[PDB]
Structures are given as C-alpha cells and as structure tokens.
C-alpha cells in the first residue's frame, strides 16, 4: 500500500523526470536489454541497437503508461486496466521480468535524479514500481 | 551438485517412469496451473479449459517429447550443460522462449512425480529432484545472450 | 482473485485432509529444509532432524492458520491480520521463501490426495497459497 | 562471466569509489527501501526512520566493513568462490542471514553507484555491475548447507 508520503515523493521524483520521461523509458528498457539478456525474448523482432527508434518509441508507450499511474496514483487498477487485460491475455510476460524493468528503471531514475534521489524517496519509487507491476499481473490467472 | 547416493535416488525413480505419459501430464499442467505460457502454443487448438488442455493431443504429443528430451538428460548428470547446448541454443534463437519457464515446468514436473508415485517420493528423494531441474533449467539457459 | 470455483475446489482438498493437516504442515516444512537449505536460517534455534517434534509442533501452527485461511477465503486479510502483523513486524521473512514453502505444501497435497489433486484443483491450491503469501506480506513496507 | 572489457570497466570505476561512504549509504538504504532486512541489526538502536538509519552510526560503520570486503573481492574477480568461502560459512553458520538480502544489497549498491556517478554509470558499465554483485552473492552463498 502507498502511503501518503509514497505519494507525494513519487509525483515530486515522476514531476522532476517531467519532459524527459520517454527518454528514461527508454534508457531503462536499454538498460534491461542489457544487464537481462532474457528479457530480449520478448522483443524478438525488435532492432534493439544502441538508440534504435523502436526502443525509443517503446520508452515513450511504458513512460506515458507511469506517468498516467501517477496522475492516477489513488486508482490505479482502473487506470490501468486496459494495459492489465493486454498484459494478462496477449503479452503474458513472466512476472519475474517485471522487477527487472523496475530495477531497471530505478537505475535510470538514479543516474538523472541526484537532488530527489534521496532514501526515502528510493524507497517509495519501490513500492509505487512494484505496486505497478502488481496490477499488470493480477489478471493473470 | 548431487551426491553419489542422489544421483542412484534420481536414476532409480526415473527408472519406473513412464515419460510419455508424465510428460504429457506435465506440459498439460503448466498450462492450465499458469495459463500465460499458453502464449508459445497458439497453434496447438483448443485449450479454453483444463480438461481441453490435458485431453488435448497436441499437448500430449509435445509434452512426451519435451520429457523424451528431459529423460536423456537424465543419462548425462554430470554434464547438463554440454548435453542441452543444442536445446538452449535453439529455444533462445528460434523460439524465443524466456528461460523462467523452464524452472516453472520443473517444478510442475516434481509435482506431477509426487502425485504420481505418492509416499514413495519422499523428502530426500524430491531434494534430490529439485537438483536436476534446476540443472537442467540452468543448462537450457545458459546459451541465451 | 479468487475465484467461486478456486473457493469451492480449496475446500475440497484441504477439507480431504482434515486430521492429517498438521502432519501434511510438518511434511512440507521437512521437505523446504532439505530441497531449499537457505530456509532453515530462519530456524536456527530449532531441531530440524527428521521427525523433530519442533518441526513437528510447527506443522500444527501452519496448518491451523491455513485452516483459518480456508474457512475465511473470502475476506483473508481480516481473517489473517494477527499473522500479517507477525510477520511483517517480527518474523521479517524474505519474501522468495513463501513459493519455496508453497511448492512444497502442493507437493506434500499432492503426494497424499491422489484423486483429489487434478489439474483444476492444482491450479486452484496453487491460486490460493500464492494468494496467502500476499496477505502475510501485504505489511512489509 | 565477465568478460576483458567488462573487468576493467569495472575496476576503472571502482578506482573512483569512496569505499567507505558507498559502504553505509548502500547498508543503509537497504534497511530503508526493504525494512524487514533491519532483523538483522537488533543491537544497532534506533533504525525508526530513514534518517535515523542512514546516520545511525554502527550502520555507517558496519557499512565500511561490508563494503571493504566486497572491494576486496573486486581484486579477485576470478575466484570469488574462494574470497568468499570464510565469510559465506560465517553468514550461514553464525549470523543465520538468507542469502537473498545479499541479493537486494547488490542491486541497492548499483542503485548507489548510479546516484553517484549519473551518466558515467552507463547502460554497459551497469550490465557488468550486474554480474559482479550477482558472482558476489553467488559466493557468499556458497558454503550455505
Ligand atoms: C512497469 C511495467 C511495464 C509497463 C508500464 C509497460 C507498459 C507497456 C505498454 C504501455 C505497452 C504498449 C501496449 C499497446 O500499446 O498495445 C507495452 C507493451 C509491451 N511490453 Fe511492456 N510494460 C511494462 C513491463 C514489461 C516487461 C517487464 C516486459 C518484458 C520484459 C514487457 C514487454 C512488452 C511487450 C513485448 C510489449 C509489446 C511490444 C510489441 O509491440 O511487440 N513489458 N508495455
Ligand atoms: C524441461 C525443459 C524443456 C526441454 C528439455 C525442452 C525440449 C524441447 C524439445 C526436444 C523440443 C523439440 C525441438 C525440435 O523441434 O528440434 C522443444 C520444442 C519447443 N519448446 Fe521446449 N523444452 C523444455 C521446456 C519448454 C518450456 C517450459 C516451454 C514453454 C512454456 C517450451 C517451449 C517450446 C516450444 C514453443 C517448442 C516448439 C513447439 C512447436 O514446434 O510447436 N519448452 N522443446
Ligand atoms: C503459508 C505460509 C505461511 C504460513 C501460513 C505460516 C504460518 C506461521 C504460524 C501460524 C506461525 C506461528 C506464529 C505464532 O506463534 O502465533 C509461524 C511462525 C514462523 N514462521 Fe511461518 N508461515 C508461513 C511461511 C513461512 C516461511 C516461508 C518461513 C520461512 C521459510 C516461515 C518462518 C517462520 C518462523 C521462523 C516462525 C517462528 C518460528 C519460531 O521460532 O517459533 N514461515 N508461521
Ligand atoms: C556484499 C555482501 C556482503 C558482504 C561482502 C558482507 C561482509 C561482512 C563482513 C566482512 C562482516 C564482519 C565479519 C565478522 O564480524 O567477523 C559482516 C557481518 C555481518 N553481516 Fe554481512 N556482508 C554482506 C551482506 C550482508 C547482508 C545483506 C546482511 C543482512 C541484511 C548481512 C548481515 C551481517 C550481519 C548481521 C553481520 C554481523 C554484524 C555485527 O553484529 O557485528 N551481511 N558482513
Ligand atoms: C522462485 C520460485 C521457487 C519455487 C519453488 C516456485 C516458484 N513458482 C512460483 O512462484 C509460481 C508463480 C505463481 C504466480 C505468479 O504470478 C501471478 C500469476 C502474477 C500471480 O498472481 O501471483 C501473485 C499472487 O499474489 N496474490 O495472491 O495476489 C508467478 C509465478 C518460484
Ligand atoms: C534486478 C532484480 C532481480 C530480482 C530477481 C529481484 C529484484 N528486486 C526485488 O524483487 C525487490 C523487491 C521488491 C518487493 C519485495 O517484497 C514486498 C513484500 C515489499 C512486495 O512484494 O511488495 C521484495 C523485494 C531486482
Ligand atoms: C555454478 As558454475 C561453476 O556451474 O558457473
């Protein structure tokens, strides 16, 4: 569960990212690609070179998918329920990969965000990842 | 690693195992316990509800294969890695399948093997099984890149 | 989520082991130490040789707090929330450990209710102990 | 496992890490974005809020000795098995400690390093990381029984 200071440090970290969101979308699926070569099995017939327009397109479609999360923080299951049923009844991507993303994603979010980067705020971009990828699996099964 | 008297425990039960059907049954549960991974089956038919997917005779088909192969991975405990090599290669480059799946079928797989041979599967016998799946899980992944 | 045909097949099964549940809980908590080693740092101060009656002992207070489970699978994290709070607060048991403990209970179910653990029924148990391992996580942080 | 080019991205990096602090900012926030690990650190007093153990002083100086032992084991990345094998029997036999928090240390660390170095901690110096924090807890789970 988020709390109200999770709320508030998330939107503060998400409102910083501001305009550059796509691009750390994308830098995070890069950095996946990378670090979780597996992941790649998921996009096989992506160009998943160094600054391919795919991944950049693909950064920007996760990027608008949080940043509507955060507009939406106190409701998020129906916010996100179109993009749960895609992931439960089409792209059925393990679970496990899901906390690679977010890992991932919080590297990103590290390596942009010094100032607002702090502890607590480590902590609650965590749980809002996590919180995330929860509604995108809980139809499943 | 297994131990001398692991390795007997593993190549005893299996010897009693009749591979057709408990890999059909195996394959069959993994899709009905986690319905996602029917992804790679599309063109296998009907599989909308359980009894679907275990009476199903394409999943029964592959099912006996896939533990055909498991089976003789068997006879090679002492290298997973080389043996599966040609597998690993191939669900990575050609079918594209993300390596988690093949540690959640072993563990169907030591489910189906405790349904089936009941109190004979015993706490160190099962130990003793959880250490081959992983092997071979491990093998099939590791020539992904 | 649960669903009325999860609820129904849950009963069943457990409902089949009635007496035989502290026994079947001592079988799975035997079965996690030998085939996941790393869970018995959370029993240091335990006898886990076989037939411990510790091991034993504890079979019985996990088996009667899936009991619990069972009979209130429709609002768990009430019937739960003493345990959640236990678990959250004291216990601190790194998430990963509740599949170990999970798989082991469906094999344990599995090795004693030949007729009674079909395909449905596995999905369904397995539904379930998934589903108690996120109640008594839910308090982590 | 690493390869030539990889090793000496990550010992160039390293050659600019103030051990030390990485150490308890890194204990640190592994106690704040995953509370439940803080079972461990009973006698270290108050660990309450993210300030309290972030400047909690036994946690900044249980941090170093972390920390310096991990930027040893940096100096022998082809044998971390065996830099580790006291320390790993120490962490089972000893402290009782699940080898899964040495996993969620590892990925706070490159959290870390990416706080510290931004850009520098590019997306190929992260993916070498990565598998040196996953071959460290590797080790110290090692003599686990
Ligand atoms: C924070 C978690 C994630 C979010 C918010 C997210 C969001 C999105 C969105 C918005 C789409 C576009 C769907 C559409 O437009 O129809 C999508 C597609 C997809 N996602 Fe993710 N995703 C997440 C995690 C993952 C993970 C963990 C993987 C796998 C490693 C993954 C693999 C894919 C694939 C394969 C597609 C379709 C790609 C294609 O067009 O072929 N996603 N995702
Ligand atoms: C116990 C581990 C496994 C082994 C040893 C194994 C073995 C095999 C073998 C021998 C083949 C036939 C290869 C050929 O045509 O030359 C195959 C095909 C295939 N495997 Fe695996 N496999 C395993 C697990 C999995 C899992 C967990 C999945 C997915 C959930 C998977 C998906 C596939 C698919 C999609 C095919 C091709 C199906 C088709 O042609 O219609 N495998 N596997
Ligand atoms: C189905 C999941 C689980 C259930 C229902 C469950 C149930 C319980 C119950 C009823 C107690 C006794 C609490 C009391 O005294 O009131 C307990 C204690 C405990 N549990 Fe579990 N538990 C679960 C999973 C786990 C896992 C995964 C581990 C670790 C691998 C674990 C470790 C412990 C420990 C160490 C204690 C205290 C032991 C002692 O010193 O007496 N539990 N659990
Ligand atoms: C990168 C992995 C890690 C390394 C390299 C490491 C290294 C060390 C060293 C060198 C010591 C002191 C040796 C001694 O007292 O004889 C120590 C102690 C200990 N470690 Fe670890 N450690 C690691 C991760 C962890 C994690 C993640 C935890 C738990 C959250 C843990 C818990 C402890 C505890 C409780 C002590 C004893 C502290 C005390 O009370 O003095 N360690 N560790
Ligand atoms: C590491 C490891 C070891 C061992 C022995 C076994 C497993 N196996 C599993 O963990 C199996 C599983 C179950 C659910 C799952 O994901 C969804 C569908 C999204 C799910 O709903 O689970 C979350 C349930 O939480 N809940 O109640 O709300 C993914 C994998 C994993
Ligand atoms: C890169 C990588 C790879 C893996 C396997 C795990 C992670 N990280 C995590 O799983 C972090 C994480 C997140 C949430 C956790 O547990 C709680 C109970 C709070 C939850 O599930 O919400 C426990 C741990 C990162
Ligand atoms: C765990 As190993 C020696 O097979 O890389």
């Known amino acids: 569960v988020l709390s109200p200071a999770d709320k508030t440090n998330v939107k503060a970290a998400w409102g910083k990212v501001g305009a550059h969101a796509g691009e750390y979308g994308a830098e995070a699926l890069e950095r996946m690609f990378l670090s979780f070569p597996t992941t790649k099995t998921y996009f096989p017939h992506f160009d998943l070179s160094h600054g391919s327009a795919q991944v950049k397109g693909h950064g920007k479609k996760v990027a608008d998918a949080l940043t509507n999360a955060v507009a939406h923080v106190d409701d998020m299951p129906n916010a996100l329920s179109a993009l749960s049923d895609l992931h439960a009844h089409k792209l059925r991507v393990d679970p496990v990969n899901f906390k690679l993303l977010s890992h991932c994603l919080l590297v990103t979010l590290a390596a942009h965000l010094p100032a607002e980067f702090t502890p607590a705020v480590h902590a609650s971009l965590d749980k809002f990842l996590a919180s995330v990828s929860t509604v995108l699996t809980s139809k499943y099964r | ?145």
Chains 1, 3 share one sequence.
């Open chain 2, 1 to 145: 690693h297994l131990t001398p008297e692991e390795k007997s425990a593993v190549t005893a039960l299996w010897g009693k195992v009749n591979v057709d059907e408990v890999g059909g049954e195996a394959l069959g549960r993994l899709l009905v316990v986690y319905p996602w991974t029917q992804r790679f089956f599309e063109s296998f038919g009907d599989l909308s509800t359980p009894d679907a997917v275990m009476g199903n005779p394409k999943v029964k088909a592959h099912g006996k294969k896939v533990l055909g192969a498991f089976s003789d991975g068997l006879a090679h405990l002492d290298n997973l890695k080389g043996t599966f090599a040609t597998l690993s290669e191939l669900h990575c480059d050609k079918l594209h399948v993300d390596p988690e799946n093949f540690r959640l079928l072993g563990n169907v797989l030591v489910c189906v093997l405790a349904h089936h041979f009941g109190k004979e599967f015993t706490p160190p016998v099962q130990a003793a099984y959880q250490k081959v799946v992983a092997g071979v899980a491990n093998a099939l992944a590791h020539k992904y890149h």
